[model samples]
Target: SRARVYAEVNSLRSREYWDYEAHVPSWGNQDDYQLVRKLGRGKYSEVFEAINITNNERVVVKILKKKKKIKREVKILENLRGGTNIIKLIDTVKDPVSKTPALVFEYINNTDFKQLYQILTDFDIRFYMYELLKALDYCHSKGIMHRDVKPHNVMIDHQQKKLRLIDWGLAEFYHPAQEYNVRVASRYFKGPELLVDYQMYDYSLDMWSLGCMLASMIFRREPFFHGQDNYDQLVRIAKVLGTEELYGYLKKYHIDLDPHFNDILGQHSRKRWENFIHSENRHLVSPEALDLLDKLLRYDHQQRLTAKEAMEHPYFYPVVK
Candidate 1:
């Protein structure tokens, strides 16, 4: 779907902004930043809590695997370098001995979201989420969609009233009508567009991803949707949002549900959003919260809230003051 706002951002700019494939990266001295302890790891890279020796400041280092992926991320990060709560890009460096590529960034004293959300009061959630919307709007205005919008990619330092959107590795430049890799965002947060294998998605995809986060936090579900495999991901979403509107979304987009879903699919009416509230999370649910959540989680990608519209949602009125 074409974005209602900032849809032409990349097209209006010089080719240098979106043309990462042709750009060559210039490296910095690897000696400036030293890895201290391992932070986390997965297939393509290892993360380390690094120290910038030059300035004696704490930072993060991501030792990436592929050459092309590295260049794209660096360019994307550079373009968004100093906008709002977007993660500050420190330097791009490479190991002199082995010639491995690495990126260093401003450090965030991040408490895991699992623990963080549990203690967040109603006001706390409102505050941090508004902060997050700032980053989302800034990046989207630059014609970028953060395909990975899960809580793990968001860093919060509550005491400082700080939040930063981290990880540009999966982010892409939003070009209207361009088909993209649907295998981008994390499973639980995948949008209906991703699940139905609709490739011509745009920035609104992040609104759905953020909706999953907002739903889990408000309902205290840990994950709003739980699925074992890629196929099951949509089933989980349909179970909550219902099977009726899903078909409508598919029909509008000319997408077909894979034949595998024929047997497992059962008719489901949309579960009332208010029904998810309980004594435990009742305090977190408000009329505005439910309304905002409803707008964000719709099956139609274009119908989802743009980051700017979300920031102006009535639920955020208190946070702005």
Candidate 2:
């Protein structure tokens, strides 16, 4: 309801760029891409490490659980196709019997983000974090919000020092004044807006997820907010950010907490960001890192930094310079 920042908010929505129905995919043959092994799976799809025998190069085949989600992801990825640090969509295909759709993507030699995060030096963290911002800023500028932004969706090839933002299944084109589904994004990385059932959120949601990823890397918490469920997710966030501030965010939006929170939610004092620093992660800590995290993890979505503004922050000066 109240504007927080970013004057040209949802500007991309004004264009006809995201008219998904107008574009049709040139379907590829599923047999062309051979499955090597299972890469991963989500509620909506299964991913496999595969190769294009024609070229004998590796690729990833993502099989969709339903036709609609497959169409939506293909459209978004295609729209995001020439952007920096965005995963490339090579082709679209489908199974014969079920007519189940699948997507083929250029492969990256990615290490699991958790393992990659632990081994990264302070400079490496800043470098890759800047790369991630490039991807986020591009998408937001294009009028798309990557609703699901977390460690798993970010592909990191530390050997090449490359990063790619993947998984557009939950992404949606921003239309001003529209209410989107809140049941998006991973539980731990869900922004306060999502957990509090604020549907009119915009690109700032992804910045919150980005902040969570950065906090985990710098503070050595695999998940800075390890909430057990949707309800508990808010409790975990409140523990760090404080309930008083959370109430302020609610009041600004004229939102009422779901009755489920009445018994579980309690008053909490804001915890100092400095308290999270410890010996293991002390090397990754700095005034800039703490300052950026403080601006990003705010309870109000609008208070979080835009991807472009965050890239300009002093935390990235070493990498960007």
Candidate 3:
């Protein structure tokens, strides 16, 4: 653990102050769509497989609840229509019965890794992950960040073994110079740069989560960092890959660690954390793939790898066809 410091931010504006609400105007009237089967459910929306009566085609309908963020997701999806690897958003319909909006998407069949992790053999896992990277590259090239890159969000076709990315609610098109305020990602897959709130977080935030997923694919277990709280999570990270080099990004943004952090841990805690993500895993990753992951997952947004360069990595060359 490095020495802790603190700084106050007075002029910074809150995310609520942004015109986020206005961008997402409410629907004038809700539309009705028959529910087929429950696909998935989360705090933001409920997904179901349905058939569009107007056209005889199976559709994956995602019903979004009234909230401040749904508008942003809709905006991102609209811009993402140019992509094929990404999930297709057919049309957005409002539920006339419930007063909620249902976002219709292309129905993809297959098992997500959250479920497939148990049944998949090593060969399937490797092929599946390669598909994930391809989709990720597409998202990054378009400047749309898939902020939440995890197993559950990935869909694989049972017969074809093709992959398509879903759940664009957290995505946003961002430039390196832009400021990213939202601190998100599954606690288990979060990166060092993200944990400290580097002002200009970028697409590499996805890479760190990807790396965490890759480790799980090979080891069949959670990586070094997993804990009950954010601080504890960081500690778990420190015990394996801790270093002042990564934390320096926090200072550039004028932020500092809490003072009480020192008393919460014992001496040599830093050393233990450093030894956890030893260079062994790096050797296992192909040169190009490793380079991409390291660059994208860097603490400084500027240092993070771009999506195009990552797609060129050797790991994806096999799946290029």
- Listed in order, each prediction's TM-score against the native is 0.97, 0.95, 0.76
Residue by residue across 112-158, what tens digits does model 2's lDDT show? 98778888888888998999999999998777899899999999998
> Model 3, 243: alpha-carbon shift in Å?
3.4
Best-fitting candidate, measured by lDDT? 1
Q: In candidate 3, residue 37 scores what lDDT?
A: 96
- Candidates 1 and 3 compared: the better one by TM-score is 1
Candidate 2: give its CA RMSD in angstroms.
Answer: 1.9
State which candidate has the highest TM-score: 1
Q: For residue 121, what is the lDDT in candidate 3?
A: 59
Give one digit per residue, the lDDT tens place, for model 1 in 187-219.
Answer: 999998888788999999999999999999889
Error of 2 at 187 (Å): 0.4
Clashes, model 2:
0
Give the Å error, residue 180, model 3.
2.4
Candidate 3: pairs in clash: 31-94, 238-273, 239-273, 240-273, 295-305, 296-305
Q: Alpha-carbon error at 84 in model 2, in Å?
A: 0.7
State which candidate, 1 or 2, has the greater TM-score: 1
Worst 10 residues of 3 by lDDT: 2-11
TM-score rank order: 1, 2, 3
**Predictions in order: lDDT:** 0.89, 0.88, 0.63
